[PDB]
Symmetry: C7
Subunit: 256 residues, 7 copies
């Protein structure tokens, strides 16, 4: 009945091990952190290393009480698969949680459509990205769902491009409408005039004739450029005599 030495051989080896465990991780990601591989690639890889050691420890600590050793791998591994399954979801969120910090297709502050919802990005935490619609809402999207989808990024390209489609009446001057516009974009300062600058007759529409105007600006400029150019095209087409035709329709009339 000092076969209950085993009982202390357990608590010997459990704590002999738990302590040689926790220090081989602090010394695994001692190396990793200084190799500067990553912050949470360290914590994932090293707390794994730490963990397979507590794993080995439990086996010899149990074996020296009399536990089959082939059923330690069983119970552990299986009940490991429990913890796995449950946190399997979030573990995938952490993949893109690191994958979003490096590469950063979008970086904090940019405006991005991703997964259909679009806003300015506050922070990419470990599981989720937080953003703000220019509306004043907080949208929080799972990192996984983000990296699976198209990341549309409005900011990281410094030169964006406007597109006006404008309608005139069918009997308007095909050339005057081109020249008033050409001169309207020539007289704007926030329009890059080395880049694309097209104004042409695009569509023989339903009730109208549609001219398209494409003019690249600075990123920050772009929003205001449109509003200022439209402010004008309304007056300078009115003053010039051109009509923005109301929906036109020919009626063929019959008294029955």
């Amino acid at each position: 009945l000092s076969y209950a030495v085993n009982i202390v051989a357990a608590l010997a080896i459990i704590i002999v091990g738990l302590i040689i465990a926790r220090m081989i991780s602090n010394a695994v990601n001692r190396l990793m952190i200084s190799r500067k591989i990553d912050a949470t690639v360290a914590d994932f890889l090293s707390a794994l290393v730490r963990y397979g050691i507590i794993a080995f420890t439990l086996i010899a600590a149990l074996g020296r009480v009399g536990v089959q050793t082939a059923s330690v791998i069983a119970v552990l591994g299986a009940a490991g698969l429990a913890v796995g399954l449950a946190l399997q979801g979030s573990l995938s969120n952490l993949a893109a949680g690191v994958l979003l910090v490096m590469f950063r297709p979008f970086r904090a502050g940019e405006y991005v459509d991703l997964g259909g919802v679009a806003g300015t990005v506050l922070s990419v935490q470990i599981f989720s990205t937080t953003m703000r619609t220019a509306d004043g809402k907080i949208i929080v999207i799972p990192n996984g769902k983000i990296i699976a989808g198209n990341i549309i990024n409005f900011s990281r390209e410094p030169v964006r491009r406007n597109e006006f489609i404008i309608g005139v009446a069918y009997d308007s001057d095909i050339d005057q409408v081109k020249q008033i516009l050409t001169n309207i974009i020539q007289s704007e300062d926030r329009i890059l005039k080395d880049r694309e600058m097209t104004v042409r007759l695009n569509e023989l529409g339903a009730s109208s004739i549609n001219f398209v105007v494409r003019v690249w600006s600075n990123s920050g400029d772009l929003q205001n450029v449109y509003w200022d150019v439209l402010e004008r095209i309304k007056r300078e087409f009115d003053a010039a005599g051109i009509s923005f035709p109301y929906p036109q329709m020919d009626v063929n009339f019959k008294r029955v």
Copy 2:
């Protein structure tokens, strides 16, 4: 025939074990609860620890009646996978059930669209969140389905932003419509006048000309701000002589 000692060696070890089991969990999450790691990360992890011990116990208790030990891992593990499979669904709901309490992208009482349905959030219980449409319905969404999807949060940002689009007739004053509006938002007290405050000519529409007005308010204020500002723009555009044009259409007439 005292080989039926085994039969009592079972009930010895089954109950020797069941009792050393149930107390190593109460002592595992004794540590976890005081390390304050979580409420149900304790109950999940510790009732696992408790459980792999009843698992080991069944093996030696059976082995000392004469059960193959390699078919205890079989039956158990397999019939474990039964219990797993069946409750595998809800186990994932509990993931986000803890994952929603920490982080809380939305906290109790906020208004949120998540998974398309939108309401004010009562409680995030273990499997499901409960909410109330401002309509007076109870919607209960599975925690899993929530954490997989975009969490849109209207409340946690304290400053929200309205957007009026208003139409005038084509021959209205391009500047007066800007100034009446500019003065309408200047005279509102619940409008933050340090933040964005744009009023411009946005769209050369079908039958109308459309001015957009964007003015940030307080979160709670926002709903009423719109209703009060629209109450005005209707009168102050009427009194000013501006027409909100009915759908306009040119008819080209022919007696056949």
Copy 3:
């Protein structure tokens, strides 16, 4: 050739076991039923316990005829996976079959939209819920498909809320339309007048001007409240002189 003792050692152990089997379940869920854990958590867990015992029994009963024991785990476990696979579907239905009875987000008799189809709920049996559209159809939805989806519940909130949107002509009295309405909801008895009670100018519409009216009632009351309030707003807007404008359209006329 009394090596066919084995043959009776089988039928000994098969029936020695089948009987020690069926009584350890009746005694497992003897405990479970009295611990009152559940009705079918008993039947699932206990008929599992009963079953792993018939499982062990088959192994020693075969082994004492001369069956490899490692191919009993094979055949059984594998042909177990057959039965599993086939009934794996319904086993998930039974998850939500118990999961619906406890929690009951919706209880028998309530009106609920769930999975898009909506009705009053008769019974939640083990696999499926049965409901009745207020139309007079029986819809039976799998319990699984239910618990995966939004459960929208109209009844369990005792106070519901109506929403009228009403149109007037553009030259109607912005204040009279507010006061006739305000007085129409003041004079209804089934309207909770402590709760929300808004009437405002909501939309500068196409051919009309739209006032929204939001008034909370009792759950049972709500359906009739609308019908009775609309009955009135039609007359009291007619008698008052206000026109519910037919679709308005300006024609600009030209002889060609």
Copy 4:
């Protein structure tokens, strides 16, 4: 070279076994069929029992020719997984193939929408249900796809309910339209007058004013009740002087 006794030890044991196999199934579902558990739960469970015995047989019959026994479990089990995979689809169809005969949410002859396609059902065979659109087409739906989806059942509720929405002109009599209708449903014999019977002003529509009429009938009656009640409401609204208004539209006229 009478080590080719083994060769006959195989054909001994293969056929010794194949025959003790096929008779333990006929005697397994001898019990099952008389316990009346089911027709094809017998054939599935028993032809499994029969089968794990041909499985054991192959192992000892091969082992006594000199086949590794651990590679019989391999080949068999694996090549079992072949047969499984291939027929895994249909095996799930057979789940709902039995699951549709018991419970029968819909029974032969009823009219049901399920999976969107809707018809009258004649037979639920082992894999598939066959139905007839009231059109005269045969639609055959896989049993699996059925049990996964909403089963909408029109027949098993004996009392169904019609819903008329009818429009009048804006200047019609709000009360007369209620009384003509009330009297039209009072004078129909196939209308249950103890059940719901509402006639009210439901919608202040575009060009019309819409009254809703809800009246429960017998299941078989319901189709004809509508046709007969509409036959009337057309005449009794014509004779009464009420107009079913053609699409109304106000034109504001301008010579340009």
Copy 5:
């Protein structure tokens, strides 16, 4: 160095086996083909039987050169799983490839909608069905995608049913329109007059009043029956004085 007897012990056993292999399949589906179970259930099951024998053979042929036997099951089984995975797709197509020949919900030549695309079917080969839109296109649908989906079958029901919806003006004769139609279907020979034959007032429409006419015909007849009956209803409604009303609309006129 006659330990390279092993080397010939391999080629002995490899070819001793390959030949006892290929003849136990020819003799397995000798039995199966004559039990007439199927054509390709033979080829699938028997070429499996043939195959697990080449499988056993490789193990003893390798073992007698000195290959671990537990790594033959490894390599084979695993590299088996390669072949499996790759052809796993088509193996499922062959399931429904046999599953379509038996049962044949649709048989060669019938017109069927299945998976949305619809045509006349001329062959169900092993993996795929081929069809012809009545347009003159060849559509080839994977057998798998077919058996998963609703099989809509127009031909196998010999009596199909037409449905005319026809509009008259609001002031047409409610009874005459019923009698002209009733007499139009009475005078057609290809209309089964024992079966359903309804003509009633179905819809109080927008600009018209709509009568529905339902008359069952022979399968082959049905296409022409409609074209011939419509040919008539156009003239016999014209000759009778009934107007098929052009879209009606009331204009309420105002000089502004």
Copy 6:
């Protein structure tokens, strides 16, 4: 310390094996290529055979340095599953990559809709098919995505069929419109007049009466046949006096 013979026993067996490996594949698909089974069924099957031999080799080469042999199956097999997983995607593309060359539902040059995108098919390489929209775009579709979906094939049927729907006014000649058309298709040479050739009154439309014309042509002919037949029906309906009615609408007029 000539226990480093082992070290050369490795490089002995690694290269003894690598060479007996690479030549049993060249001799496996020596047989396969001459059995002409396929080009890449050879390369897949044979480079598998070659590979399980390098696999066996590594085990004995390692074992004779002192590697556990049960952890060679581990590392290999597992790190095999790495390579598998990564290239598992493309391996499925190669399935249909061979599966499209045999059967070829579409062969190079045909016009096909498959997966919704439609064009003329250049080449079916190992992973992907390349096509050209008649537009002048290159669309490259994964072979997998192709074989999973409906393959619609316009070319392989040599006789295609046009369908004109044409409208006349309500008071047009029901018979003349049939005879002008009948004679228009009688006078075309590229119309097969033995095949289907229907011209009938199909739809009592909104503002028009619609005649359908169905006439089968040669595949290549079909595109031009329509254009040439429509060229005519426009004139021969104009010359005949028949009107293609502009959208008709009855106005019921009221001075308010």
Copy 7:
């Protein structure tokens, strides 16, 4: 107590191995890089080879401290499956990351629609492709999502093709509209006149008669060709007297 030789036997073998490891990879992809198989097929395959060697090393290094060896395969392999699972996502992105450098269906700079979003492609890095909408946005699409989907490629075909649909009035000259157009495309220099060049009467439309014009150009030319040809067809149809008819509608008039 020089049984802690083992402890140094570990650090012997761990570092004896780690170093024979890291150099057999540098020497595996020494061969691979010079066989020029690929850049990252080297890094994937070789860092695998390097890795299964650190894997073997850990087993003998642990075994000579006293670790079960069968639980090294367990812990490693299992905790391997951790790392696998987490990076399993991106590993599939790297598949198409190499798969989109070879083959390159689209090469850097081309304009492509893929996965619905369309732009000019900057770079195909290891996980993701980056592109620029001609708008001025950066869209970054996961390589996986790309190779799964249709790659539509506008550039790699050097000859693209325009398509004009133009409407005239019903009483326009069927031949003149053909000849003005024919001459408009005859007089353009950037139109390949050897390739397709069709101008025909395509659609007998609602309010108009629609002529289609198909003319192939150079890739770069195509955008401008349309704009220049439409510029003309507007004037040369105006000057010729042809009317682009406003939406036509016959009114049948009635005083009520």
